[PDB]
Design a protein around this ligand. Structure first.
Ligand SMILES: CC(=O)SCCNC(=O)CCNC(=O)[C@H](O)C(C)(C)COP(=O)(O)OP(=O)(O)OC[C@H]1O[C@@H](n2cnc3c(N)ncnc32)[C@H](O)[C@@H]1OP(=O)(O)O
Ligand SMILES: CC(=O)SCCNC(=O)CCNC(=O)[C@H](O)C(C)(C)COP(=O)(O)OP(=O)(O)OC[C@H]1O[C@@H](n2cnc3c(N)ncnc32)[C@H](O)[C@@H]1OP(=O)(O)O
Ligand SMILES: Nc1ncnc2c1ncn2[C@@H]1O[C@H](COP(=O)(O)OP(=O)(O)O)[C@@H](O)[C@H]1O
Ligand SMILES: [Mg+2]
Lengths: 95, 472, 191, 95
């Protein structure tokens, strides 16, 4: 029943370890899954990039897979608008 | 048995082989240099690996050991060399075949035979295809003078290893024969080293019909159709049209039959092309490229065939007419006529020198009958002088050659690449010429037409307005 | 048993596949007919018995309808656009460039891509490659639904009927897509 | 002779008015032609945009030709780099 509840709460069938971790920490696992759906696997970034983000005119390489490497470069940080939403001008994979 | 392919090239051809492999269901592995880290082909593959660390990018792409190591580490099965870098290198193909990896190309003896012009000339002379009258091979100053004394002027000095207007130049009289032979020997020992040299009987105003050859290891050898790359600027192909609309159909059939009989006598496998110098119902063998051509797209359009896909299927060992499913030789369709223009950063107002810089504006034309094979030409791309000057090649196909000409004119006027100077006005001038539209263009057509270099001024009222607004 | 339904007195959206299989420019012929010219003498079209049939062509319309939201049209900025090319691919793009703000006033169509080949299986494979190569980010498209329809065995056979979509609930099972570029950029911008 | 000199100086065939303007103002006409090749026809902009340039998130319409109206919007003004070249993020014709 908790496996079915976890499957209907995260959108896919979990393994034994996900069910066990949901039993131990119910809310913490759900928050982790929500931030995994939002920000993705942030475990692959460098520690200064994980903590302090990015600098202006800075190039980083993120190894998301074997043979896949994201070439992320930040070019401009925009001013906040009336809605409070800044616009960041990135250069992901050269584009 | 083959589930992963590696492409040891870059640019348009790498993405072309990636698309062919993804259609065939294979995984793709890419290689790139540090200066090629922003290329499109790096991100168009499942896996990409950095090769040639600490070297110049051109020599980095020729690193046979690094490419072999990447192919072994990534688990690739086949290696497609593309064209222009290692597709005719015998050592690279030998190491690939000896390392346990499939090479998507002809066999090693084919590369040995057709990699040198002397050996290819001897094989063609054995094959009873009409060659061009030249010397016996590596001849000196006196040997070149004997050819002029016996056969007669005009002549032409050609190297036995050069390619693309590099080791070849024209020759008319005795003193400039000496000067050209000395400069050709110097360029051969400089650029290549250990290269032979010959002198052949020159032909005034020829054509450059090329025949694409496909063949598997089961013995079936098929010509797709002919081409017409006669529009040349200093022996460099500019516009290639297929089929040769300025030729008779029976003469084109004779040329194709001669090419397929030469390849049958040799025993050719996979993709390759045979070049013929045509002048007044007399075709002369000049070269064979054991490659897939950059201008293979027009052949793909007119014959309805996928040359790269059939190349990979032949490299898999499949039968040509049973497993690939290709039709017979007599049933190969010739639908329409296709025109290919290769847009490069060579600025025609600056002596066709390549241009570098950021591409701040790119807009590609779509529509009916338009095929695009884009390299690295997206917006914001920084053009580097290390690699080729090609941005994007575009092919227009239609039932009538006039319709193809009009479609290419519409495409060239619809193309908008800003930030770097391109040869689009030169292509527009060549397209608008009456000699090109008839199809009777020769290899001296560009150099004998000064009207093609009168480019009208373009207003460019957007970029200048933005520049003024930014300045103020 | 064929039955008449209606006649559309216009050039249709799916005229591209007819253009590809017959080689005849429909819009150019329409304009030349409106000029008053003749079909087989001034336009230059061949006779009815000599009209070619150059293989099979497939067209799907890529719209902003989200299949996970009841196929309702989506709106918003288009962050990424990468139009595929290659042999046998023809694209008739509308308003789908990068940075384009999709408005709910007009049609949901972004790009109308078509694939043509000698064999229908090759056309199916080319369209599958095109659908996997298309990248439209910022708005939700019907690309996974088109991939599911293409991968179905009835469509590849060619015996698909009008009720084929409504009686196939397996076409609505869309795999999870882990866009590790957009999420990484979002997290980096947030931090 | 002065018509041929003006033709080779500006790269195109001048009219009678261009020749008679070059005769009276030699250097001024050459400077005007240089700014014409650089910035283009700036006479089609309105006076506040001609004088003060553009503002942040300001949309203007410039009619360069009858039927041709440019849609220029300035999105961001980048920071100056070490070489001193700012990068301005425009939206010309929606792109
Ligand atoms: C759809 C097709 O088949 S394209 C066939 C060619 N016809 C066209 O492109 C129609 C649009 N016309 C043009 O773009 C120009 O007149 C061309 C073809 C001469 C291009 O040469 P240029 O001198 O360099 O462009 P021009 O200075 O005249 O115009 C400036 C820009 O205004 C744009 N523009 C063109 N027409 C319009 C218009 N009606 N409204 C607003 N902007 C326009 C153009 O995109 C042009 O290019 P840019 O934005 O990148 O800077
Ligand atoms: C030429 C052709 O035929 S391409 C046909 C489609 N196949 C491929 O592109 C192979 C590479 N794989 C991908 O691009 C994607 O991962 C797909 C097709 C599997 C779809 O997965 P998605 O969830 O939608 O995107 P995903 O986050 O996993 O890809 C990682 C990012 O790195 C990019 N990337 C993809 N391959 C590589 C690579 N070898 N190196 C660096 N970056 C890469 C992707 O473009 C993607 O960026 P994006 O958001 O702009 O699209
Ligand atoms: N004998 C000749 N007469 C006239 N033109 C020639 C002759 N030999 C070569 N050319 C021109 O020089 C070019 C050289 O082509 P070729 O030697 O076949 O390939 P590559 O340029 O790759 O070495 C050809 O395109 C041809 O137009
Ligand atoms: Mg050649």
């Amino acid at each position: 029943t908790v496996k079915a509840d976890l499957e209907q709460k995260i959108g896919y069938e979990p393994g034994d370890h996900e069910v066990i971790s949901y039993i131990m920490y119910p809310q913490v696992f759900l928050d982790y899954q929500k931030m995994q759906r939002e920000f993705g696997a942030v475990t692959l970034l460098d520690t200064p990039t994980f903590l302090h983000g990015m600098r202006l005119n800075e190039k980083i390489e993120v190894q998301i897979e074997k043979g896949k490497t994201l070439s992320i470069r930040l070019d401009e940080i925009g001013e906040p608008d009336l809605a409070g939403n800044r616009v960041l001008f990135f250069n992901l994979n050269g584009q | 048995h083959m589930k992963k392919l590696l492409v040891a090239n870059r640019g348009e051809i790498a993405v072309r082989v990636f698309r062919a492999c993804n259609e065939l269901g294979l995984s793709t592995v890419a290689v790139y240099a540090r200066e090629d880290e922003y290329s499109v082909h790096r991100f168009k593959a499942d896996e990409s690996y950095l090769i040639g660390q600490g070297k110049k990018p051109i020599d980095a792409y020729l690193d046979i050991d690094d490419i072999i190591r990447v192919a072994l580490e990534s688990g690739a099965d086949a290696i497609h060399p593309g064209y222009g870098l290692l597709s005719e290198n015998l050592e690279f193909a030998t190491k690939v075949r000896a390392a346990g990896l499939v090479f998507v190309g002809p066999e090693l003896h084919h590369l040995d035979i057709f990699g040198d012009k002397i050996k290819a000339k001897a094989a063609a002379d054995e094959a009873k295809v009409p060659g061009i009258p030249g010397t016996n091979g590596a001849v000196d100053i006196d040997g070149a003078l004997e050819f002029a004394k016996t056969y007669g002027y005009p002549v032409m000095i050609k190297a036995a290893l050069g390619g693309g207007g590099r080791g070849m130049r024209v020759a008319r009289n005795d003193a400039e024969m000496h000067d050209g032979y000395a400069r050709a020997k110097s360029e051969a020992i400089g650029a290549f080293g250990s290269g032979e040299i010959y002198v052949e009987k020159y032909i005034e105003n020829p054509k450059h019909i090329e025949v694409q050859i496909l063949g598997d290891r089961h013995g079936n050898i098929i010509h797709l159709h002919e081409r017409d790359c006669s529009v040349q600027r200093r022996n460099q192909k500019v516009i290639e049209i297929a089929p040769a609309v300025g030729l008779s159909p029976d003469f084109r059939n004779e040329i194709c039959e001669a090419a397929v009989k030469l390849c049958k006598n040799v025993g050719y496998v996979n993709a390759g092309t045979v070049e013929f110098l045509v002048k007044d119902d007399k075709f002369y063998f000049i070269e064979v490229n054991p490659r897939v051509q950059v201008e293979h797209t027009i052949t793909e359009l007119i014959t309805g065939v996928d040359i790269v896909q059939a190349q990979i299927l032949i490299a898999q060992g499949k039968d040509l007419h049973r497993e690939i499913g290709l039709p017979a030789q007599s049933e190969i369709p010739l639908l329409g006529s296709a025109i290919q223009c290769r847009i490069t950063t060579e600025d025609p107002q600056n002596g066709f020198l390549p241009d570098t810089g950021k591409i701040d504006t790119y807009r590609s034309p779509g529509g009916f009958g338009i095929r695009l094979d884009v390299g690295n030409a997206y917006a914001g791309y920084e053009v580097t002088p290390y690699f080729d000057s090609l941005l994007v090649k575009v092919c227009t196909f239609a039932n009538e050659f006039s319709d193809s000409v009009r479609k290419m004119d519409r495409v060239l006027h619809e193309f908008r690449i800003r930030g770097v100077k391109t040869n689009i006005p030169f292509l527009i001038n060549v397209i608008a010429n009456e000699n090109f539209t008839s199809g009777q263009a020769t290899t001296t057509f560009i150099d004998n037409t000064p009207s093609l270099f009168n480019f009208p001024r373009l207003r460019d009222r957007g970029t200048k307005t933005l520049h003024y607004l930014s300045m103020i």
